[PDB]
């Protein structure tokens, strides 16, 4: 809507925003992240991971 | 439903001031000076913990 500037998710976090220079709507998407896990056998057996 | 609501409540807890002036870490960092900013982040981190 013309008055509305920011959009928010169900859990009260921003998911959309409106550019002030140009009246368009943009979907804000977080940069990718995740947990790094290392798979290895016993160090006595080998060192490959 | 229990699991979904628990996650929702955990995410929702970020938006509360928890005794500090603002619930936004960037706002408190930008507006205020390292000592009292440290006080505010202390409040935020202890509450979120």
């Amino acid at each position: 809507l013309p008055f509305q500037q920011f959009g928010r998710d169900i859990a009260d976090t921003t998911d959309a925003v409106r550019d002030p220079q140009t009246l368009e709507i943009l979907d804000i998407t977080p940069c990718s992240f995740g947990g790094v896990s290392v798979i290895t056998p016993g160090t006595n057996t080998s060192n490959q991971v | 439903n229990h699991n979904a609501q628990a996650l929702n409540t955990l995410v929702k807890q970020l938006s509360s001031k928890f005794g500090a002036i603002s619930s936004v870490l960037n706002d408190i960092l930008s507006r205020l000076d390292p000592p009292e900013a440290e006080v505010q982040i202390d409040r935020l981190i202890t509450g979120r913990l």
């Binding site: 859990a11 998911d15 977080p30 | 929702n8 995410v11």
Partner: peptide, 29 residues
Amino acid sequence: LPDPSKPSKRSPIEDLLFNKVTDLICAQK
């Protein structure tokens, strides 16, 4: 018994149980 026609290879009772049980996920992520 399993139903060959269904791609999931599930019995009709299993199919009914699966169907009857169901941006929040993105926000939690």
